[PDB]
Amino acid sequence: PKIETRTEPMVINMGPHHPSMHGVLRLMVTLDGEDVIDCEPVIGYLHRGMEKIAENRTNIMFIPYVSRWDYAAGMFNEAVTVNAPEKLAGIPVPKRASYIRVIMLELNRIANHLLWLGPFLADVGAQTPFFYIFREREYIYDLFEAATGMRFINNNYFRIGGVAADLTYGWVTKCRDFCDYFLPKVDEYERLITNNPIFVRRLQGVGKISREEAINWGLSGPMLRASGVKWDLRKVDHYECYDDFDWDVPVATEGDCLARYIVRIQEMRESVKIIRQALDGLPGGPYENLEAKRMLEGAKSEWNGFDYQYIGKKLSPTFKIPKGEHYVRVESGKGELGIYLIGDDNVFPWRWKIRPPDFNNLQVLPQLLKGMKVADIVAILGSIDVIMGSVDR
Amino acid sequence: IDLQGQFISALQSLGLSHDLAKLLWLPLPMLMMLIVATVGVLVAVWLERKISAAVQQRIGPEYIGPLGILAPLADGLKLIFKEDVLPANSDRWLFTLGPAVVVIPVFLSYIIVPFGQNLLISNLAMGVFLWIALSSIAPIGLLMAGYASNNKYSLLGGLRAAAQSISYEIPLALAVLAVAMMSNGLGTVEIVEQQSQYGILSWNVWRQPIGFLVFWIAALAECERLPFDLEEELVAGYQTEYAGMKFALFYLGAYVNLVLSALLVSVLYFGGWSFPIPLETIANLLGVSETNPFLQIAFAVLGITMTLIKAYFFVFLAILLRWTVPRVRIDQLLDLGWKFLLPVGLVNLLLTAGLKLAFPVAFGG
Amino acid sequence: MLLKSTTRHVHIYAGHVVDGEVHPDTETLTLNVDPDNELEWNEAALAKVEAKFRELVANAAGEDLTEYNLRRIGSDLEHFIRSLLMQGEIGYNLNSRVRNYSLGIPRVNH
Amino acid sequence: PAILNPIARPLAENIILTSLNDVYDWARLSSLWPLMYGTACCFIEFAAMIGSRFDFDRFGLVPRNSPRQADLIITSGTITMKMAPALVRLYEQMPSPKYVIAMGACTITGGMFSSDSYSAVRGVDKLIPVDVYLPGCPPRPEAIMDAIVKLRKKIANEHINERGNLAQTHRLFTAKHKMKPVPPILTGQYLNAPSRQAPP
Amino acid sequence: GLLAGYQFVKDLESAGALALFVPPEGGFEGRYQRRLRSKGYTTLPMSAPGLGDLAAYLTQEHGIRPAHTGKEDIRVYFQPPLVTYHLENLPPNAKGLVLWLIDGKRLSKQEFAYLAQLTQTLPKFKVVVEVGGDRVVRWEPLADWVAA
Amino acid sequence: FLNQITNYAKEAVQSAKYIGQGLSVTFDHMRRRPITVQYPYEKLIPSERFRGRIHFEFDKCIACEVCVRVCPINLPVVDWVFNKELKKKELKHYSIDFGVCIFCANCVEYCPTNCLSVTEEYELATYDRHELNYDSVAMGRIPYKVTQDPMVTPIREFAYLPAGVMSGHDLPAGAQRAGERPEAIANTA
Amino acid sequence: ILPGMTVKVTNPNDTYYQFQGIVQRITDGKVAVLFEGGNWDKLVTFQASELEPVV
Ligand SMILES: CCCCCCCCCCCCCCCCCC(=O)OC[C@H](CO[C@@H]1O[C@H](CO[C@H]2O[C@H](CO)[C@H](O)[C@H](O)[C@H]2O)[C@H](O)[C@H](O)[C@H]1O)OC(=O)CCCCCCCCCCCCCCCCC
Ligand SMILES: CCCCCCCCCCCCCCCCCC(=O)OC[C@H](CO[C@@H]1O[C@H](CO[C@H]2O[C@H](CO)[C@H](O)[C@H](O)[C@H]2O)[C@H](O)[C@H](O)[C@H]1O)OC(=O)CCCCCCCCCCCCCCCCC
Ligand SMILES: CCCCCCCCCCCCCCCC(=O)OC[C@H](COP(=O)(O)OC[C@@H](O)CO)OC(=O)CCCCCCCCCCCCCCC
Ligand SMILES: CC1=C(/C=C/C(C)=C/C=C/C(C)=C/C=C/C=C(C)/C=C/C=C(C)/C=C/C2=C(C)CCCC2(C)C)C(C)(C)CCC1
Ligand code: SF4
Ligand code: SF4
Ligand code: SF4
């Protein structure tokens, strides 16, 4: 062995394995003791070349790829890639279909917020939110397997006209039971942090992200709300009738890990309130009342029309898109998702520019890891809620 | 009764020279205590696995035997069959004998713990010295294995684990000193006799309540239950370099240290081989108990049972408090140790000396 | 920097094996053919593989030492191994612990 | 020759040695220490088994982050060619009685990235010898337990007299090249860079 | 445990096809599969759900169509019979061959009689089919399972 | 200076009370039964929406080559020939690889004559990958039912429980699909 | 029964209660039943005494 201890700064090379919950990222940490001076991130072990996939591909052949873009929720990319051609060609959408769309989007946002505080609390302390959070997510897994057929992203469920399938018979009742049971589980998770030992004092002043630096660096998502900027993209642009229920954006004063935790903790309750008001909506009730009013009443008298249908119009498999470019923005669980699509009157599009939400937020990680300890590196890496499939893509 | 005296008389009736006959009598209990120690280790591994399963609402290892009790035996039989791998360095004998230097004295310290008046090995004067000075050797083997590890991160983790281990030796000695002052002796036999004189009212847990908590915190820091030093600055502290054999040796050594600490804490504070009702009243109520062994054998079995339920209770409490209290950093652990266990231990020794010099009636005199 | 590129059969190491380890050296390229028990070999086809490796390392001249060119040389070597297998030469062996046809399945010409 | 890719052609035992071989195989069947390696949602599907719903621990498999105390590796996820020498070194640093379970459609073959792709590796069997394949995108955790069951059925096929197969032959060859020396790659040097604070 | 002797080999040499009942929680047929290699038989692992037709894959040659992506044209690969080519360059000692089917639950009872006649037509290879089993290791004749 | 000592003592007794509350909830967690399932002794019930293997029929097929363009990888091949006696084409061979399959069930939806079917098979484990080109007579077999196997124990998932059950392990009644089927509503109401 | 007729499952133990299906083929006393729910066509097999013919 040749270990010559000298008076030079030690370069720590964190490998791209990360065998706790993280993907592939080569971190080169340069320090001179019990601090952190420099940090170099190296990516490129998960890039699959998605932009070359959409060079010769139609809309019906791009759904599993665009669902395998991000492996946390997936349906946000499907929702924007069924919104881009329907706005390029000008195809309307029914109200009940958009209600089902926003219900499934908020139900995936619930699971996406649930898969952040697992490793973030595991890498800082006791390893017993793990099994209960995984049980609470396996409940959502069984609910989605009963509803559509799968537990996550491998699920098409979306076309240009609307949703090809419908909800089952007991899905609304089990969803009401899940809204009954999910609220004390998040009150317990807030009571775990509202009166605590030094866990509150440990991650209290490690980030310290100011407002103007977050605006200049281009932060979007829960970090922009933790900095104190009300830029929720669902309030700027009404996506699918977002101006009908009550809304409340949780805004924190300072930007730290505890504030970014409690913003998502409150946002769980806000999403529960939104899906409760969506169950309070649904103009026509569940599928049983709709089937009874269809089979009991006349053929086209009052119920069967344009607004309350499965799709509304069966689209062609090989259809032509109009020539032009388009850009839409949707607030996702990580940040803002956008698609810059260019068509030139053909089946296969010309340019498919993808706007990733985590690749723009990863630029704060060289600024965040500066002058901190060794044990705060994994907590800082887990607090931003980044995904290697989103920054490599 | 006396099995050793009867064996000596039988070997004298057979015809021998009284020296080689008495020479070979000791290795049979000297191997019996070792094999029941491995039995207790195979008990404790299955117990820790099934209790960690029952805490997190699941079932432990199954489909290996009746309920998976052969799984520690299967692990110990499989890990000695694996290929011993070596890194690209020198000093292969040092890398081999490092874990041997770790494993020798913790296994050697089995001559101290008792199980009764006669069911023990050595009680000469100073068994607490033979525990402390032999348990304070394993940092040398840890630093030797870290130097023979040939790594930048594993050596730093071994240095951090050695600095964590050597700091909790001084309150571990002061809490022993606070009981040895009151017991006016260093052997465990007089310590357990001063507790087994009376029943509950002569226990050292009610006489020294702060020292028991200090000794328990020092034992949980020494046997690496709450300090996670096995995410340790890249992946692990003193791991990711050995094979299945050296990892199995480290695992059994850690479980031997846990079993020995869980026995020694109860022996020094609560007291194995003890009953809430004194044995003299039961012996006077039953009949004549001075030569009849039919009740004495049952009393020895009851003392072994009391020691075993105390050891099982302390093991279950330690492995229940492992996943109960959250993980704290090693710097905060060293800070809380050096700022709590030493000053309250010193003032506890001072108030112990003051209470012994004030009223020497209920203390050791 | 230890430059290497190996998949299952070829090992192009940019060093030199002294006894059991390697040292970084940009002057010697060591080639290891089929380290795992997957194909049975001989002395003539291995000599043809070594001659093709010498021809491929004589073709690549005046270029920088990067991972891309070394991986391209290893890919041409594995393509030569696959064409030698398809030519009517040595193939798989029924003596390993696992039998996975990674290059091709035995088929019929006519 | 009319046959493409040909296959070359390649006893009393004791009862006590047979029982010792049964014990030696039963120990490996009972312990079965795995390695958790995952870069995508297949790692989340593997971590869903570690939770208290499917109880993957009850067969004897315990989660270890060390690629040295694991006799079984579980590769999972879309594999980039930049991660292929990393996977080769992680497989080679394991001890000799090792097993390979490949979970996923993009792992055992090209998967969805087999039509228009230039970075994804089309098959992990080109990198590591796969013993038990597992199709599915993503597969059921019951299918992963079925692959564990088939691996346990395949481990007991080994012998104690035919143990001379877990090695690698030498076949060394030494040749020279005429390549040019390359400048080194960046190691750090991100924040305190001379072109970062001072604008050119 | 249970010290098993040499009894499956005699039952395999007496009849032509056997069906063993194993517990599906782990693996216990590997001991008999290793005892068969210790007696001098060459084992061949094969999966029973994916086989196509038994006649065209075991007696004659078949044509496999690889999955093309539109890049290549429609090609056909001529696959020989598996057990015939395994019996061609087989023998070190010329004792016998066995065929092991892992998941024999996803099969019909029509091809089982054809397989039991095929293993009796050529006396050089055996047929071993696995059933999901009921709590104990027991062997049964495959012709008796077909007839009943 | 004494107020910092009293604040430290208050923080210490609050940490001791938090440790005691953690011990209390840990002792509370030992009372509930385990909610896990055994394999292969307690297999889950597949729902009507959970997909699986692709089943192909050789009778209700016309070889129209429609579902090949719907597939992004074009995995089902159509080996069709042209016959001069008839006026249409016939299918000779049908092969499909399953190692590159996404299992999204998109070619089954765009089928007017329902030539493809969903089969409840997920137990696919093979030591080699070259047998994955499944034949039509291999895809035309009978699926394995989890009910008819007497060695497994049937247990439903969370969303298949009557009137709301949080455990879903005992199931003493025989009721399922919590709600009402749309047949008795037309009878009563 | 004949392949091509509509049957109905009436077993109170299974999850599929009173579901109309299409018979595909008959072998070994087992009936393949094709269900039509939504936009996907599932095929769940049953027995010969489990189903009842519905005109
Ligand atoms: C969660 C954790 C779980 C932990 C695990 C729990 C599960 C396992 C629990 C198992 C129980 C734990 C072990 C028991 C405590 C250890 C007792 C022991 O070590 O104890 C050691 C004992 C020795 O202890 C005592 O030893 C005495 C000798 O003591 C002398 O020697 C001692 C030193 O050994 C002390 O110094 C003592 O002061 C001194 O007096 C006598 O021998 C006593 O009889 C004996 O009880 O070893 C023996 O038992 C003798 C060794 C066997 C010798 C066989 C006897 C010889 C055969 C005689 C046959 C006679 C045949 C002729 C018959 C005549 C026919 C007419
Ligand atoms: C197929 C494989 C087959 C393997 C075959 C192996 C068979 C042989 C091993 C079997 C061991 C199990 C059988 C139990 C024997 C227990 C005998 C016993 O305790 O014998 C007692 C004697 C008593 O010793 C004598 O006891 C005397 C009386 O003292 C006792 O009483 C005094 C009263 O004040 C004091 O308390 C004193 O401390 C206490 O020891 C003196 O101490 C003498 O010095 C000493 O000789 O111990 C002795 O000699 C020492 C005996 C050592 C036994 C230690 C084993 C652990 C005990 C089993 C665990 C308890 C299980 C009971 C289960 C019942 C459940 C309901
Ligand atoms: C019947 C026998 C029961 C004995 C059980 C006792 C064993 C428990 C020992 C704790 C091990 C873990 C130590 C971690 C402790 C931990 O991690 O936090 C320790 C915590 C550190 O807090 P901070 O980091 O804020 O403090 C340092 C900073 O303030 C720096 O300025 O506070 C302490 O220093 C106070 C310690 C009180 C500890 C009390 C322990 C005893 C609690 C239970 C009392 C039980 C009474 C039972 C009556 C029946
Ligand atoms: C005579 C005899 C016998 C008997 C026995 C017995 C009777 C026993 C029992 C006993 C027991 C059975 C014991 C045990 C115990 C244990 C436990 C039970 C522990 C646990 C607990 C804990 C550790 C906890 C903690 C806590 C605290 C401290 C605080 C508060 C809260 C709580 C409570 C949680 C026999 C048969 C053997 C034989 C021989 C003789
Ligand atoms: S097979 Fe599917 S689930 Fe697995 S890594 Fe590939 S895309 Fe993800
Ligand atoms: S399965 Fe359907 S789409 Fe495919 S060739 Fe047959 S009829 Fe046409
Ligand atoms: S499920 Fe999808 S990937 Fe599989 S064959 Fe059908 S269209 Fe192709």
UniProtKB/TrEMBL annotation, chain G:
GO biological process per UniProt: photosynthetic electron transport chain
Coiled-coil annotated residue ranges, if any: none
Descriptive protein name: Tlr0636 protein
Organism lineage: Bacteria, Bacillati, Cyanobacteriota, Cyanophyceae, Acaryochloridales
